[PDB]
């Protein structure tokens, strides 16, 4: 399973059951696990569409790079690239609340995993932005905000361009 082989499950997430649709698209390129994207393709926020269990459900999207400054010494893990909450089922990020604005990943050292994680919320709720994007912890965030295990996750690989 790409999420296990890449250690996204492990480094960032506990094992979970995929249950909700998460589609992340940059330009005309849909992200699928492990595809390579160039930094020049990800300068602006992607389109994000989600599924859902019931139209009354709300979801939170987290985007992180766990490989900062480098995958071999990731002492700033995780870097928070984007956070959007209160996304109504079957819609997407433009219908949610943007807690932390999108910052484009632009790795310079090694291959970085760029991970999108979707969580089901118990209901709408207030979420606070961190004061720094470095040293974010998705597992701890999910615990604080009662988000449970992920319902979906996808990642791409990116490295410095040539």
Swiss-Prot record:
One biological process term in Gene Ontology: cell differentiation
Gene Ontology CC terms, in alphabetical order: cytoplasm; endoplasmic reticulum; nucleus
Name recorded for this polypeptide: Protein FLOWERING LOCUS T
Key word Transmembrane present: no
Tissues in which the UniProt entry reports expression: Mostly localized in leaves vasculature.
Described function: Component of the mobile flower-promoting signal (floral stimulus or florigen). Promotes the transition from vegetative growth to flowering. Required for 'SEPALLATA3' (SEP3) and 'FRUITFULL' (FUL) accumulation in mature rosette leaves. Seems to acts in parallel with 'LEAFY' to induce flowering by regulating 'APETALA1'. Translated in leaves and then transported to the shoot apical meristem where it activates the transcription of several floral meristem identity genes. May play a role in both the autonomous and the long-day flowering pathways.
PANTHER family: PHOSPHATIDYLETHANOLAMINE-BINDING PROTEIN, PROTEIN FLOWERING LOCUS T-RELATED
Molecular function in Gene Ontology: phosphatidylethanolamine binding
Entry's family note: Belongs to the phosphatidylethanolamine-binding protein family.
Organism: Arabidopsis thaliana (Mouse-ear cress)
Name of the gene this protein is made from: FT
Keyword Glycoprotein: no
């Amino acid at each position: 399973d790409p999420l296990i082989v890449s250690r996204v499950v492990g480094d960032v997430l506990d094992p979970f059951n995929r249950s909700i649709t998460l589609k992340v698209t940059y330009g005309q390129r849909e992200v699928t696990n492990g595809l390579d994207l160039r930094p020049s393709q990800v300068q602006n926020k992607p389109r994000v569409e989600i599924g859902g269990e019931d139209l009354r459900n709300f979801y939170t999207l987290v985007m992180v790079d766990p490989d900062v400054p480098s995958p071999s010494n990731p002492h700033l893990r995780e870097y928070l690239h984007w956070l959007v909450t209160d996304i109504p089922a079957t819609t997407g990020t433009t219908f949610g609340n943007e807690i932390v604005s999108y910052e484009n990943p632009s790795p310079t050292a090694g291959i970085h995993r760029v991970v999108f994680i979707l969580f089901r919320q118990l209901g709408r709720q207030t979420v606070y932005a961190p004061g720094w994007r470095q040293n974010f912890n998705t597992r701890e965030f999910a615990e604080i905000y009662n988000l449970g295990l992920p319902v979906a996750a996808v990642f791409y690989n990116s490295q410095r361009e040539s």
